[PDB]
């Protein structure tokens, strides 16, 4: 569920998923199309890409459980949809953490028309 992801995001970056990440660039939050504007945007692209490999799971509403082993995010055994979802979120969390230094606010609330071009996952 978005609950676990959002929390994972906040612990990791200290920023709130909504709104620091729900509308960022071309891929954070909406998905659809375009060329990721930047590293964080790529994190969302590869994320939207991750959920794409689980066609029969429900990322937004299926709740999984994780723990921190000293700072590490550790997904706990759950259904397999739950496990594979959790891994996809950990990546994003990490990825965001790895590029906070270039998170730019000129991408917050980015208008859709500026998002065009192709990208295949
Ligand atoms: C390309 O990226 C995707 C693909 C599928 C997705 C999502 C994002 C999100 C999250 C979102 O992008 O809001 C949800 C909840 N998806 C599904 O549950 C889903 C369920 C049935 C089918 Cl047939 C296809 C997808
Ligand atoms: C997945 S969505 O429909 O594209 N919108 C949405 C996007 C991201 C997040 N979130 O917490 O990262 C939360 C989101 O939706 C919420 C809005 C209000 C309260 C809880 C979740």
Curated annotation (Swiss-Prot):
Cofactor: how and how many bound: Binds 1 Ca(2+) ion.
Major location (coarse): secreted
Catalytic activity: a 1,2-diacyl-sn-glycero-3-phosphocholine + H2O = a 1-acyl-sn-glycero-3-phosphocholine + a fatty acid + H(+)
Subcellular location: Secreted
Stated regulation of activity: Oxyphenbutazone (OPB), anisic acid and atropine inhibit the enzymatic activity by binding at the substrate-binding site. P-coumaric acid, resveratrol, spermidine, corticosterone and gramine derivative inhibit the enzymatic activity by binding at the substrate-binding site.
Gene Ontology cellular-component annotations: extracellular region
Record SMART domains: PA2c
Keywords of the record: Blood coagulation cascade inhibiting toxin, Calcium, Disulfide bond, Hemostasis impairing toxin, Hydrolase, Lipid degradation, Lipid metabolism, Metal-binding, Myotoxin, Neurotoxin, Presynaptic neurotoxin, Secreted, Toxin
Lipid metabolism recorded as keyword: yes
Gene Ontology MF term list: calcium ion binding; calcium-dependent phospholipase A2 activity; phospholipid binding; toxin activity
Keyword Lipid metabolism among UniProt keywords: yes
Function: Snake venom phospholipase A2 (PLA2) that shows weak neurotoxicity and medium anticoagulant effects by binding to factor Xa (F10) and inhibiting the prothrombinase activity (IC(50) is 130 nM). It also damages vital organs such as lung, liver and kidney, displays edema-inducing activities when injected into the foot pads of mice and induces necrosis of muscle cells when injected into the thigh muscle. Has a low enzymatic activity. PLA2 catalyzes the calcium-dependent hydrolysis of the 2-acyl groups in 3-sn-phosphoglycerides.
Subunit and interaction comment: Monomer.
Additional remarks: D.russelli pulchella is synonymous with D.russelii.
Protein name: Basic phospholipase A2 VRV-PL-VIIIa
Organism this protein belongs to: Daboia russelii
Lineage per the UniProt record: Eukaryota, Metazoa, Chordata, Craniata, Vertebrata
């Amino acid at each position: 569920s978005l609950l676990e992801f959002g929390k994972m995001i906040l612990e990791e970056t200290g920023k709130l998923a909504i709104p620091s990440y729900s509308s960022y660039g071309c891929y954070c939050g909406w998905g659809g199309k375009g060329t990721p504007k930047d590293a964080t945007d790529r994190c969302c692209f590869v994320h939207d890409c991750c959920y794409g490999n689980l066609p029969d799971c429900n990322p937004k509403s299926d709740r999984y459980k994780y723990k921190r082993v000293n700072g590490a995010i550790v997904c706990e055994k759950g259904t397999s949809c739950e496990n594979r979802i959790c891994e996809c979120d950990k990546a994003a969390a990490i990825c965001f953490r790895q590029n906070l230094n270039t998170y730019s606010k000129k991408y917050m609330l980015y208008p859709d028309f500026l998002c065009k071009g192709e990208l295949k996952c």
